[PDB]
Each structure stands twice: as structure tokens, then as C-alpha cells.
Copies of this chain bind each other. A is one copy, B any other.
Amino acid sequence: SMKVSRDKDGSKVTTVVATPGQGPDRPQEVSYTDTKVIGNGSFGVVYQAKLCDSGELVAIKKVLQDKRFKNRELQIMRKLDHCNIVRLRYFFYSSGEKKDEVYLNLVLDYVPETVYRVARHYSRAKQTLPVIYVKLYMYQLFRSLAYIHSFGICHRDIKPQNLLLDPDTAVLKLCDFGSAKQLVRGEPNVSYICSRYYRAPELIFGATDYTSSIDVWSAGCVLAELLLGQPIFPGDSGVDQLVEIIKVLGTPTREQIREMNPNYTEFKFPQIKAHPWTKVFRPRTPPEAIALCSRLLEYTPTARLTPLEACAHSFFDELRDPNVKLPNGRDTPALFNFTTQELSSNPPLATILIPPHARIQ
């Protein structure tokens, strides 16, 4: 149930009874106005709304609730609390019209921009993003992957449209968990997840025993695209994307093929040597960025860095400098407030991850 009403200016106000996303189940009376759509697609609509009291903007994600099982994205978002993941404020059920069908409404944080839109403005104007921002956005993405992976949860759809940005504060928040799943060893998972251009090679080869290192592949593809100004592995079909990977990574050995898809899909590729990564990027591209990519875009899934090991990479050393500032002069966002959960994959890395000036009493 929801109660539609209005104000003196006919401004029109919706009031629902929602459950808070985190914390104990204490229903809340939430009133919002100025509902406008911000793109639909597949799952359903994603609306923007203004909360009547605080005036804060929020997002509402309206999808159709299956009456059999509870919604998997709901169950994951409720376990998550991290500064680089879009927060689930409230959720409530409703019905559009008659239908006899129930809708699930996820009330999330609003963030004005996406990496996709930002990187597209620079690419249209024949330029690239300032490396300080590429460091800041990549770091916060790797932080969010390290957090969700600590729970065994794989995003399975890392792409620039899923990376929200506050331009003022340089904050990045991972969004869209409608494909995320907990990966349990020995259970099979569908291989048709993840968007084209960002799918790991084991996904293209149809493997169903893939681990969380697919997200790291994807992130490596986001980084290279910020550096190149265009997708590094484009293609309208599996075969085309493989060709563009071979061009960069070289032909995969019989051993590397086994690590990806042990089924061996029974295909023979043209034998091309390894493109020296330094020849892939612009001349002034920082060597440490090229180093990070090569360690993320690996054939062998287990040879790829983990998210936590990526943050500790020398490419992010400038972020650990005590004097680092945003170009507009503000302080950087929270970068070093790691929890025990985040660090659980490798707690000794906090000797690098937490810089000395951050542990000053």
C-alpha cells in the first residue's frame, strides 16, 4: 500500500511504508516527490525522487517480484555496508496497476554521474581523464570488490555504466547487483552474465566453474578504457573479442587454455606474438598503469591480482601521499578506513594499504 496525495502547489507526494535496508525491521514512513525516470531496461525502471523532509535526492529501482523466491539482489544489498557501494536506504513492495503482480522497490542513494558518461565526455572531446581521477576511481572500485569478495559475492557485471560518481567529492560507488551471486566452489554458474567488452576469457569460452577473478578482469578492462579512451577489447561476437585479446595478450598456451575452460571448446586460433603493452597506450601513459593492467588482464584466472592486492599496487602510491589533493583543492575521499572484513583476504597488506600519516594518533 502507498498513499498518493498533494501539497498546496499540487506538487504531488507519494508516501509509503518501507523497511530500512540495514538494521532492525522498524517500518518507516517515507514521503517523496518529483519522481522522474533515469532509464529502464530488462529488470525494470530506475527512478529519481526527492525526499520531502531532507530534500535529499534518492534512486528507486522498481522490478517485478517473483512470488516464489525472495529477490536475490535484495538479500545481497541487505548484507552490504561499504562507502564505495551504493547504500540500500529502504525497500517496500507495491503494485503498479491491477496486474495481480507485486513490484519490489529498492530506495538507494542517488549519485549524479557515471564513469561511462564522464569517460564519454572526454572521449567525444578527444582527450582522456586526468590520471589523478583514474587513480581515485580505480582504487575505490578495487576497494568495493575486495569487500564484496570477502563474502564470496561476485558482482558479475562490472562495467562503466555501473560505476557512479560524485564529481565534486570524486567518490565512486558500485551499483547494480541484479546479477551478483555468491560463488560456492563445486557449484556451476551461468556463463552468459557480464556485458560484452568486459567479459573474462573463461566466460567467452563458456566455463561454469569460474571464480570471483572475473570481476578483476572486468576492472582491468575499465582501467584500460579510461587510459585508451575507448574499449580495449571490442567486438560484436565472442570470436571478435577473442581476436582483440590475442592481439594484446598473445596466443594462450595449451596450459593457459586449460586454466580458463578445461572443457577445451575445440578451436584453433592464429598464432600472434605478445603485443608489448607499452605499445598499446599513448606515449605519456604512466608505466605503473601499464604494469597494473598487465597484472589484471591475464589469461590464467588465478594469476590475476586480487582486489586487495590491486589497491596496494604502486600505481596508487600517489593516493597514499599525505599531501594528495583533488585538483579543485578539496581533500580526497576516505581511502584508508579499512575494516577487518575488507582486509580478511590478506591482513598483512595493511602495512602498505594504511599509510603512516593515516595511523597518526
Give A contacts to B, CB under 8 Å.
Answer: 41-43, 64, 66, 68-69, 157, 159, 179, 187-196, 204-206, 208, 235-240, 242-244, 265-268, 270-271
Partner of A66, one of B69, B179, B270: B270
Query: Which residue of B has the minimal Cβ distance to A65?
Result: B270
Q: Given that A236-B196, A237-B157, A237-B196 are contacting pairs, would A265 and B42 also be in contact in the complex, using a CB cutoff of 8 Å?
A: no
Partner of A240, one of B42, B66, B206, B270: B42
Query: Which residue of B has the minimal Cβ distance to A179?
Result: B239
- Copies per complex? 2
Query: Which residue of B has the minimal Cβ distance to A188?
Result: B266
Q: Given that A42-B243, A192-B204, A206-B192 are contacting pairs, would A268 and B69 also be in contact in the complex, using a CB cutoff of 8 Å?
A: yes
Chain B residues near A187 (CB-CB < 8 A): 266
Check if A41 sits within 8 Å of B240, measured CB to CB.
yes
Chain B residues near A68 (CB-CB < 8 A): 268, 271
Q: How far is the CB of A309 from chain B (nearest CB, A)?
A: 27
Q: Could you say which of A43, A238, A243 has the most chain B C-beta atoms within 10 Å of its C-beta?
A: A238
Give the distance in Å from the alpha carbon of A205 to the alpha carbon of B243 in the complex: 22
Check if B243 sits within 8 Å of A190, measured CB to CB.
no
Check if A235 sits within 8 Å of B42, measured CB to CB.
yes
Check if B188 sits within 8 Å of A271, measured CB to CB.
no
Q: How far is the CB of A182 from chain B (nearest CB, A)?
A: 14
Partner of A64, one of B159, B235, B270: B270
Chain B residues near A69 (CB-CB < 8 A): 268
Check if A192 sits within 8 Å of B237, measured CB to CB.
yes
Query: Which residue of B has the minimal Cβ distance to A272?
Result: B64
Q: How far is the CB of A354 from chain B (nearest CB, A)?
A: 36
Check if B266 sits within 8 Å of A189, measured CB to CB.
yes
Partner of A42, one of B43, B193, B206, B239: B239
Q: When A and B form their complex, which 5 residue pairs have the shortest distance between CB atoms, in order from nearest?
A: A192-B238, A206-B206, A195-B236, A190-B265, A42-B243
Query: Which residue of B has the minimal Cβ distance to A157?
Result: B237
Chain B residues near A244 (CB-CB < 8 A): 42
23 intermolecular pairs with C-beta atoms under 8 Å apart: A41-B240, A42-B239, A42-B240, A42-B243, A42-B244, A64-B270, A66-B271, A68-B268, A157-B237, A159-B236, A179-B237, A188-B265, A188-B266, A189-B266, A190-B205, A191-B206, A192-B204, A192-B205, A192-B237, A196-B196, A196-B236, A208-B265, A208-B266
Chain B residues near A271 (CB-CB < 8 A): 66, 68
Q: How far is the CB of A49 from chain B (nearest CB, A)?
A: 25
Chain B residues near A236 (CB-CB < 8 A): 159, 195-196
Give the distance in Å from the alpha carbon of A193 to the alpha carbon of B188 in the complex: 22
Give the distance in Å from the alpha carbon of A204 to the alpha carbon of B66 in the complex: 23
Q: How far is the CB of A198 from chain B (nearest CB, A)?
A: 9
Q: How far is the CB of A191 from chain B (nearest CB, A)?
A: 5
Check if B192 sits within 8 Å of A265, measured CB to CB.
yes
Chain B residues near A240 (CB-CB < 8 A): 41-42, 195
Check if B194 sits within 8 Å of A237, measured CB to CB.
yes
Q: How far is the CB of A263 from chain B (nearest CB, A)?
A: 8
Give the distance in Å from the alpha carbon of A165 to the alpha carbon of B201 in the complex: 35
Give the distance in Å from the alpha carbon of A192 to the alpha carbon of B191 in the complex: 11
Check if B157 sits within 8 Å of A193, measured CB to CB.
no
